[PDB]
PDB file of C-alpha atoms (C1' of nucleotides) and ligand atoms in Angstrom:
ATOM      1  CA  UNK A   1       0.000   0.000   0.000  1.00 56.12           C
ATOM      2  CA  UNK A   2       1.557   3.270  -1.186  1.00 53.00           C
ATOM      3  CA  UNK A   3      -0.647   5.773   0.681  1.00 54.11           C
ATOM      4  CA  UNK A   4       0.231   4.021   3.968  1.00 56.54           C
ATOM      5  CA  UNK A   5       3.913   3.718   2.960  1.00 58.36           C
ATOM      6  CA  UNK A   6       4.059   7.469   2.254  1.00 56.06           C
ATOM      7  CA  UNK A   7       2.217   8.633   5.361  1.00 57.96           C
ATOM      8  CA  UNK A   8       4.534   6.303   7.323  1.00 57.53           C
ATOM      9  CA  UNK A   9       7.627   7.874   5.810  1.00 57.93           C
ATOM     10  CA  UNK A  10       6.274  11.324   6.569  1.00 58.11           C
ATOM     11  CA  UNK A  11       5.463  10.479  10.207  1.00 57.61           C
ATOM     12  CA  UNK A  12       8.891   8.858  10.468  1.00 59.52           C
ATOM     13  CA  UNK A  13      10.382  12.202   9.376  1.00 58.38           C
ATOM     14  CA  UNK A  14       8.604  13.950  12.252  1.00 55.22           C
ATOM     15  CA  UNK A  15       9.562  11.215  14.730  1.00 54.33           C
ATOM     16  CA  UNK A  16      13.264  11.075  13.912  1.00 56.95           C
ATOM     17  CA  UNK A  17      13.302  14.845  13.804  1.00 59.35           C
ATOM     18  CA  UNK A  18      11.105  16.039  16.665  1.00 61.43           C
ATOM     19  CA  UNK A  19      10.385  12.934  18.736  1.00 61.36           C
ATOM     20  CA  UNK A  20      11.707   9.420  19.077  1.00 61.14           C
ATOM     21  CA  UNK A  21      11.285   5.711  19.431  1.00 61.95           C
ATOM     22  CA  UNK A  22      11.605   4.537  22.999  1.00 63.08           C
ATOM     23  CA  UNK A  23      11.948   1.038  24.425  1.00 64.83           C
ATOM     24  CA  UNK A  24      11.506   1.537  28.194  1.00 61.78           C
ATOM     25  CA  UNK A  25      12.217  -0.905  31.050  1.00 58.69           C
ATOM     26  CA  UNK A  26      10.293  -0.463  34.304  1.00 59.57           C
ATOM     27  CA  UNK A  27      10.413  -2.179  37.711  1.00 58.49           C
ATOM     28  CA  UNK A  28       8.837  -5.610  37.982  1.00 57.27           C
ATOM     29  CA  UNK A  29       9.723  -6.786  34.479  1.00 56.85           C
ATOM     30  CA  UNK A  30       7.309  -4.149  33.193  1.00 56.60           C
ATOM     31  CA  UNK A  31       8.090  -2.504  29.860  1.00 56.26           C
ATOM     32  CA  UNK A  32       6.856   0.085  27.376  1.00 55.75           C
ATOM     33  CA  UNK A  33       7.308   0.982  23.694  1.00 57.57           C
ATOM     34  CA  UNK A  34       6.772   4.542  22.572  1.00 58.19           C
ATOM     35  CA  UNK A  35       6.319   6.331  19.285  1.00 61.31           C
ATOM     36  CA  UNK A  36       6.680  10.056  20.055  1.00 60.55           C
ATOM     37  CA  UNK A  37       6.341  13.283  18.086  1.00 61.35           C
ATOM     38  CA  UNK A  38       6.693  16.496  20.018  1.00 60.91           C
ATOM     39  CA  UNK A  39       5.664  19.938  18.801  1.00 60.71           C
ATOM     40  CA  UNK A  40       4.775  23.374  20.149  1.00 61.85           C
ATOM     41  CA  UNK A  41       1.794  24.128  17.938  1.00 61.67           C
ATOM     42  CA  UNK A  42      -1.361  22.542  19.431  1.00 62.90           C
ATOM     43  CA  UNK A  43      -3.163  22.837  16.105  1.00 63.08           C
ATOM     44  CA  UNK A  44      -0.452  21.119  14.059  1.00 61.28           C
ATOM     45  CA  UNK A  45      -0.278  18.326  16.646  1.00 62.73           C
ATOM     46  CA  UNK A  46      -4.039  17.789  16.986  1.00 60.03           C
ATOM     47  CA  UNK A  47      -5.407  18.784  13.566  1.00 61.66           C
ATOM     48  CA  UNK A  48      -2.718  17.547  11.140  1.00 67.99           C
ATOM     49  CA  UNK A  49      -0.292  15.115  12.744  1.00 68.57           C
ATOM     50  CA  UNK A  50      -2.710  13.123  14.977  1.00 66.12           C
ATOM     51  CA  UNK A  51      -5.250  12.430  12.211  1.00 65.74           C
ATOM     52  CA  UNK A  52      -2.350  11.040  10.164  1.00 64.08           C
ATOM     53  CA  UNK A  53      -1.104   8.781  12.976  1.00 63.89           C
ATOM     54  CA  UNK A  54      -4.696   7.826  13.690  1.00 66.99           C
ATOM     55  CA  UNK A  55      -5.178   6.761  10.104  1.00 67.32           C
ATOM     56  CA  UNK A  56      -1.968   4.698  10.167  1.00 65.26           C
ATOM     57  CA  UNK A  57      -2.962   3.212  13.556  1.00 66.01           C
ATOM     58  CA  UNK A  58      -6.355   2.079  12.188  1.00 65.69           C
ATOM     59  CA  UNK A  59      -4.832   0.648   9.023  1.00 67.95           C
ATOM     60  CA  UNK A  60      -2.292  -1.349  11.051  1.00 65.47           C
ATOM     61  CA  UNK A  61      -4.937  -2.359  13.563  1.00 65.19           C
ATOM     62  CA  UNK A  62      -2.872  -1.006  16.378  1.00 65.35           C
ATOM     63  CA  UNK A  63      -5.390  -0.347  19.119  1.00 65.06           C
ATOM     64  CA  UNK A  64      -3.266   1.794  21.357  1.00 64.70           C
ATOM     65  CA  UNK A  65      -4.572   5.300  21.882  1.00 63.53           C
ATOM     66  CA  UNK A  66      -3.078   8.554  20.619  1.00 68.82           C
ATOM     67  CA  UNK A  67      -2.080  10.283  23.834  1.00 68.81           C
ATOM     68  CA  UNK A  68      -1.499  14.028  23.690  1.00 70.28           C
ATOM     69  CA  UNK A  69       0.356  15.178  26.777  1.00 71.55           C
ATOM     70  CA  UNK A  70       0.593  18.945  27.280  1.00 71.08           C
ATOM     71  CA  UNK A  71       3.993  19.701  28.742  1.00 68.90           C
ATOM     72  CA  UNK A  72       6.130  22.651  29.820  1.00 66.99           C
ATOM     73  CA  UNK A  73       7.377  23.868  26.530  1.00 68.09           C
ATOM     74  CA  UNK A  74       5.530  21.649  24.135  1.00 63.60           C
ATOM     75  CA  UNK A  75       2.820  19.168  23.261  1.00 63.63           C
ATOM     76  CA  UNK A  76       3.772  15.478  23.100  1.00 63.77           C
ATOM     77  CA  UNK A  77       1.855  13.129  20.803  1.00 62.98           C
ATOM     78  CA  UNK A  78       2.535   9.633  22.085  1.00 62.93           C
ATOM     79  CA  UNK A  79       1.509   6.138  21.054  1.00 61.50           C
ATOM     80  CA  UNK A  80       2.279   3.381  23.520  1.00 64.26           C
ATOM     81  CA  UNK A  81       2.578   0.301  21.349  1.00 60.49           C
ATOM     82  CA  UNK A  82       5.102  -2.490  20.840  1.00 59.93           C
ATOM     83  CA  UNK A  83       3.710  -3.111  17.357  1.00 61.96           C
ATOM     84  CA  UNK A  84       3.924   0.513  16.207  1.00 64.28           C
ATOM     85  CA  UNK A  85       7.347   0.979  17.802  1.00 65.87           C
ATOM     86  CA  UNK A  86       8.792  -1.951  15.813  1.00 65.27           C
ATOM     87  CA  UNK A  87       6.882  -0.867  12.710  1.00 66.03           C
ATOM     88  CA  UNK A  88       8.792   2.421  12.666  1.00 65.96           C
ATOM     89  CA  UNK A  89      12.058   1.062  13.992  1.00 69.95           C
ATOM     90  CA  UNK A  90      12.251  -1.589  11.282  1.00 71.27           C
ATOM     91  CA  UNK A  91      11.246   0.988   8.734  1.00 74.56           C
ATOM     92  CA  UNK A  92      14.059   3.200  10.006  1.00 74.60           C
ATOM     93  CA  UNK A  93      16.585   0.372   9.576  1.00 74.96           C
ATOM     94  CA  UNK A  94      15.757   0.041   5.882  1.00 74.82           C
ATOM     95  CA  UNK A  95      15.656   3.779   5.202  1.00 75.37           C
ATOM     96  CA  UNK A  96      18.225   3.406   2.382  1.00 76.88           C
ATOM     97  CA  UNK A  97      15.797   1.221   0.432  1.00 76.77           C
ATOM     98  CA  UNK A  98      13.127   3.956   0.436  1.00 74.86           C
ATOM     99  CA  UNK A  99      11.486   4.468  -2.951  1.00 77.92           C
ATOM    100  CA  UNK A 100      10.911   7.937  -4.405  1.00 78.10           C
ATOM    101  CA  UNK A 101       7.482   8.156  -2.759  1.00 80.13           C
ATOM    102  CA  UNK A 102       8.958   7.473   0.664  1.00 80.38           C
ATOM    103  CA  UNK A 103      12.024   9.669   0.157  1.00 81.63           C
ATOM    104  CA  UNK A 104       9.974  12.750  -0.594  1.00 81.47           C
ATOM    105  CA  UNK A 105       7.598  12.095   2.330  1.00 81.97           C
ATOM    106  CA  UNK A 106      10.529  11.519   4.712  1.00 82.19           C
ATOM    107  CA  UNK A 107      12.276  14.734   3.628  1.00 80.60           C
ATOM    108  CA  UNK A 108       9.019  16.671   3.988  1.00 78.09           C
ATOM    109  CA  UNK A 109       8.517  15.329   7.518  1.00 78.56           C
ATOM    110  CA  UNK A 110      12.124  15.941   8.486  1.00 76.32           C
ATOM    111  CA  UNK A 111      11.815  19.489   7.161  1.00 76.00           C
ATOM    112  CA  UNK A 112       8.592  20.244   9.012  1.00 78.43           C
ATOM    113  CA  UNK A 113      10.533  19.119  12.127  1.00 78.69           C
ATOM    114  CA  UNK A 114      14.102  20.364  11.624  1.00 77.08           C
ATOM    115  CA  UNK A 115      13.949  22.761   8.674  1.00 76.27           C
ATOM    116  CA  UNK A 116      14.409  26.481   8.189  1.00 76.32           C
ATOM    117  CA  UNK A 117      10.748  27.390   8.177  1.00 77.19           C
ATOM    118  CA  UNK A 118      11.090  30.982   6.987  1.00 76.59           C
ATOM    119  CA  UNK A 119      12.117  29.484   3.596  1.00 74.36           C
ATOM    120  CA  UNK A 120      14.436  32.538   3.200  1.00 76.97           C
ATOM    121  CA  UNK A 121      17.082  29.849   3.323  1.00 78.74           C
ATOM    122  CA  UNK A 122      16.579  26.129   2.924  1.00 79.43           C
ATOM    123  CA  UNK A 123      18.303  24.305   5.774  1.00 75.53           C
ATOM    124  CA  UNK A 124      17.941  21.074   7.742  1.00 78.69           C
ATOM    125  CA  UNK A 125      19.702  20.734  11.106  1.00 76.87           C
ATOM    126  CA  UNK A 126      20.848  17.466  12.755  1.00 75.64           C
ATOM    127  CA  UNK A 127      23.632  15.864  14.783  1.00 74.83           C
ATOM    128  CA  UNK A 128      23.155  12.732  12.676  1.00 77.69           C
ATOM    129  CA  UNK A 129      25.490  13.248   9.709  1.00 82.70           C
ATOM    130  CA  UNK A 130      24.811   9.817   8.186  1.00 79.51           C
ATOM    131  CA  UNK A 131      21.098  10.540   8.093  1.00 80.52           C
ATOM    132  CA  UNK A 132      21.759  13.887   6.422  1.00 81.00           C
ATOM    133  CA  UNK A 133      24.110  12.213   3.900  1.00 82.41           C
ATOM    134  CA  UNK A 134      21.307   9.861   2.881  1.00 85.53           C
ATOM    135  CA  UNK A 135      18.942  12.827   2.467  1.00 83.49           C
ATOM    136  CA  UNK A 136      21.700  14.559   0.436  1.00 80.52           C
ATOM    137  CA  UNK A 137      21.982  11.666  -2.037  1.00 83.96           C
ATOM    138  CA  UNK A 138      18.195  11.483  -2.451  1.00 85.14           C
ATOM    139  CA  UNK A 139      18.114  15.237  -2.984  1.00 82.76           C
ATOM    140  CA  UNK A 140      20.956  14.995  -5.540  1.00 84.14           C
ATOM    141  CA  UNK A 141      18.915  12.345  -7.403  1.00 83.99           C
ATOM    142  CA  UNK A 142      15.950  14.698  -7.416  1.00 85.30           C
ATOM    143  CA  UNK A 143      18.132  17.356  -8.993  1.00 84.71           C
ATOM    144  CA  UNK A 144      18.369  19.392  -5.832  1.00 83.57           C
ATOM    145  CA  UNK A 145      21.869  20.552  -5.000  1.00 82.20           C
ATOM    146  CA  UNK A 146      23.003  20.737  -1.438  1.00 82.23           C
ATOM    147  CA  UNK A 147      25.958  20.734   0.894  1.00 79.71           C
ATOM    148  CA  UNK A 148      26.529  19.362   4.376  1.00 77.40           C
ATOM    149  CA  UNK A 149      28.778  20.914   6.975  1.00 80.30           C
ATOM    150  CA  UNK A 150      29.100  21.382  10.736  1.00 78.80           C
ATOM    151  CA  UNK A 151      26.929  24.365  11.663  1.00 83.47           C
ATOM    152  CA  UNK A 152      27.034  24.295  15.456  1.00 86.67           C
ATOM    153  CA  UNK A 153      30.540  23.610  16.727  1.00 88.94           C
ATOM    154  CA  UNK A 154      29.230  23.852  20.323  1.00 89.56           C
ATOM    155  CA  UNK A 155      26.724  20.975  20.084  1.00 87.56           C
ATOM    156  CA  UNK A 156      28.011  19.010  17.111  1.00 88.11           C
ATOM    157  CA  UNK A 157      25.051  19.920  14.925  1.00 88.57           C
ATOM    158  CA  UNK A 158      25.348  19.587  11.159  1.00 86.47           C
ATOM    159  CA  UNK A 159      23.285  21.536   8.647  1.00 83.62           C
ATOM    160  CA  UNK A 160      22.213  20.356   5.190  1.00 82.65           C
ATOM    161  CA  UNK A 161      21.947  23.495   3.064  1.00 83.89           C
ATOM    162  CA  UNK A 162      19.673  23.246   0.029  1.00 81.95           C
ATOM    163  CA  UNK A 163      21.022  25.437  -2.776  1.00 79.89           C
ATOM    164  CA  UNK A 164      18.693  28.381  -3.464  1.00 80.16           C
ATOM    165  CA  UNK A 165      19.513  27.711  -7.155  1.00 77.40           C
ATOM    166  CA  UNK A 166      17.220  24.683  -6.865  1.00 78.50           C
ATOM    167  CA  UNK A 167      14.683  26.555  -4.701  1.00 82.05           C
ATOM    168  CA  UNK A 168      11.540  25.980  -6.717  1.00 84.87           C
ATOM    169  CA  UNK A 169      12.182  22.299  -7.423  1.00 83.92           C
ATOM    170  CA  UNK A 170      12.862  21.695  -3.703  1.00 82.14           C
ATOM    171  CA  UNK A 171       9.850  23.532  -2.302  1.00 85.21           C
ATOM    172  CA  UNK A 172       7.499  22.504  -5.094  1.00 84.47           C
ATOM    173  CA  UNK A 173       8.552  18.821  -5.241  1.00 86.42           C
ATOM    174  CA  UNK A 174       9.195  18.221  -1.536  1.00 85.68           C
ATOM    175  CA  UNK A 175       7.673  20.740   0.856  1.00 87.37           C
ATOM    176  CA  UNK A 176       4.425  21.581  -0.910  1.00 91.42           C
ATOM    177  CA  UNK A 177       3.828  18.151  -2.401  1.00 90.78           C
ATOM    178  CA  UNK A 178       0.203  17.018  -2.520  1.00 95.10           C
ATOM    179  CA  UNK A 179       1.250  13.309  -2.635  1.00 95.15           C
ATOM    180  CA  UNK A 180      -0.247  10.792  -0.151  1.00 93.51           C
ATOM    181  CA  UNK A 181      -2.521  13.343   1.612  1.00 96.19           C
ATOM    182  CA  UNK A 182      -4.935  12.546   4.497  1.00 94.57           C
ATOM    183  CA  UNK A 183      -7.312  10.759   2.146  1.00 91.98           C
ATOM    184  CA  UNK A 184     -10.949  11.526   2.957  1.00 90.70           C
TER     185      UNK A 184
ATOM    186  C1'  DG B   1      24.845  44.981  -7.478  1.00 88.32           C
ATOM    187  C1'  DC B   2      23.059  41.202  -6.231  1.00 87.08           C
ATOM    188  C1'  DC B   3      22.430  36.606  -4.631  1.00 90.14           C
ATOM    189  C1'  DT B   4      24.356  32.878  -2.257  1.00 88.95           C
ATOM    190  C1'  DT B   5      26.116  30.467   1.721  1.00 86.13           C
ATOM    191  C1'  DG B   6      29.607  29.540   5.547  1.00 87.73           C
ATOM    192  C1'  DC B   7      29.812  31.186  10.166  1.00 87.25           C
ATOM    193  C1'  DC B   8      28.379  31.674  15.043  1.00 83.31           C
ATOM    194  C1'  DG B   9      25.887  33.182  19.372  1.00 84.49           C
ATOM    195  C1'  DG B  10      20.837  33.252  21.584  1.00 84.03           C
ATOM    196  C1'  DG B  11      17.567  30.617  23.632  1.00 83.20           C
ATOM    197  C1'  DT B  12      13.120  27.998  22.957  1.00 83.17           C
ATOM    198  C1'  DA B  13      11.209  24.313  21.111  1.00 77.93           C
ATOM    199  C1'  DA B  14      12.372  20.127  21.466  1.00 80.82           C
ATOM    200  C1'  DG B  15      13.822  15.256  22.962  1.00 80.87           C
ATOM    201  C1'  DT B  16      14.711  11.517  27.018  1.00 77.00           C
ATOM    202  C1'  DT B  17      13.571   8.796  30.928  1.00 77.10           C
ATOM    203  C1'  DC B  18      11.724   8.694  35.156  1.00 72.03           C
ATOM    204  C1'  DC B  19       7.327   7.982  38.098  1.00 73.92           C
ATOM    205  C1'  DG B  20       2.931   5.569  39.697  1.00 70.56           C
ATOM    206  C1'  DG B  21      -0.553   3.334  37.994  1.00 69.27           C
ATOM    207  C1'  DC B  22      -3.600  -0.502  35.411  1.00 72.03           C
ATOM    208  C1'  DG B  23      -4.341  -4.553  31.908  1.00 71.29           C
ATOM    209  C1'  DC B  24      -4.164  -9.064  30.694  1.00 69.35           C
ATOM    210  C1'  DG B  25      -3.249 -14.492  29.890  1.00 71.00           C
TER     211       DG B  25
ATOM    212  C1'  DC C   1       4.213 -13.858  37.372  1.00 70.03           C
ATOM    213  C1'  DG C   2       5.747 -11.645  33.335  1.00 69.42           C
ATOM    214  C1'  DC C   3       5.299  -8.366  30.414  1.00 73.58           C
ATOM    215  C1'  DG C   4       2.715  -4.390  27.836  1.00 73.93           C
ATOM    216  C1'  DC C   5      -0.506   0.090  27.845  1.00 72.60           C
ATOM    217  C1'  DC C   6      -1.743   4.659  30.512  1.00 73.13           C
ATOM    218  C1'  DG C   7      -0.926   9.565  32.123  1.00 72.22           C
ATOM    219  C1'  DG C   8       2.219  12.413  33.711  1.00 71.18           C
ATOM    220  C1'  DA C   9       6.335  15.624  33.949  1.00 72.53           C
ATOM    221  C1'  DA C  10      11.159  16.470  35.584  1.00 72.58           C
ATOM    222  C1'  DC C  11      15.036  17.219  33.198  1.00 69.66           C
ATOM    223  C1'  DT C  12      18.393  18.476  29.573  1.00 70.76           C
ATOM    224  C1'  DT C  13      19.892  20.282  24.937  1.00 72.03           C
ATOM    225  C1'  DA C  14      19.640  20.043  19.914  1.00 73.37           C
ATOM    226  C1'  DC C  15      18.017  22.544  17.076  1.00 71.86           C
TER     227       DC C  15
ATOM    228  C1'  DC D   1      16.044  26.881  14.596  1.00 72.38           C
ATOM    229  C1'  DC D   2      16.745  31.812  14.149  1.00 72.46           C
ATOM    230  C1'  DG D   3      19.113  35.521  12.169  1.00 71.98           C
ATOM    231  C1'  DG D   4      22.694  38.927  11.470  1.00 70.24           C
ATOM    232  C1'  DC D   5      27.320  39.206   9.701  1.00 69.85           C
ATOM    233  C1'  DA D   6      30.815  38.986   5.982  1.00 68.75           C
ATOM    234  C1'  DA D   7      33.413  36.292   2.243  1.00 73.14           C
ATOM    235  C1'  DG D   8      32.956  35.035  -2.255  1.00 73.30           C
ATOM    236  C1'  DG D   9      30.926  34.422  -7.049  1.00 73.99           C
ATOM    237  C1'  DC D  10      28.975  35.867 -11.268  1.00 69.92           C
TER     238       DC D  10
HETATM  239 MN1   MN E 201      15.978  16.392  16.173  1.00 67.11          MN
HETATM  240 MN1   MN E 202      13.789  19.749  16.369  1.00 68.28          MN
HETATM  241 MN1   MN E 203      10.602  21.286  15.034  1.00 68.36          MN
END
DNA sequence: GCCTTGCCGGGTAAGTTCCGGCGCG
DNA sequence: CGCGCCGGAACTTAC
DNA sequence: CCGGCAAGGC
């Protein structure tokens, strides 16, 4: 299924960027498995992201709930689910095999999470150079030129800079792509 | 003249893991 | 008994 | 992430 594969890739962009995948161990041989996306904007969390996760949850027949925990500085969308955790973690492991549908959705998600949102410049930040290098190759194959270098010497954070020469192709083909959209 | 992009400090919007519960065969 | 979902938030830093 | 600064390219 390609609409599920794409929405997955997109969610996985948000997760890797602004959340995580947590395998927790508690006292008494108790455990927990968490798919997390955090975000400041209540409306983006509840009106765009959650309906997407909800759709994926239903289609996978995961029957965990979508928790939304309001925190200090940010909303946390959380799904407590061994099945969903491994679904994304295994999907992460085979990121290199992503097809063009998945690549674009992943880059879009990653950008919504980690990207320069003013679009004055086109920039993705991350400590994970290998992840950025994969994104770079995909972008090069989509005819979007880009460079990677160490932006934040204090915290070890790399930036992937998308060349403004390929501005239109990047925004039009990646950011504002109508592909795999909340069907309805 | 103009656009592009490496650089680098500010600080908030993220990320991570702990808690106490309850569920269920 | 042996794990897996809830609901929260303290805590730290990578964007 | 944001955003101002300055080096460099055409
Ligand atoms: Mn991140
Ligand atoms: Mn982030
Ligand atoms: Mn973000």
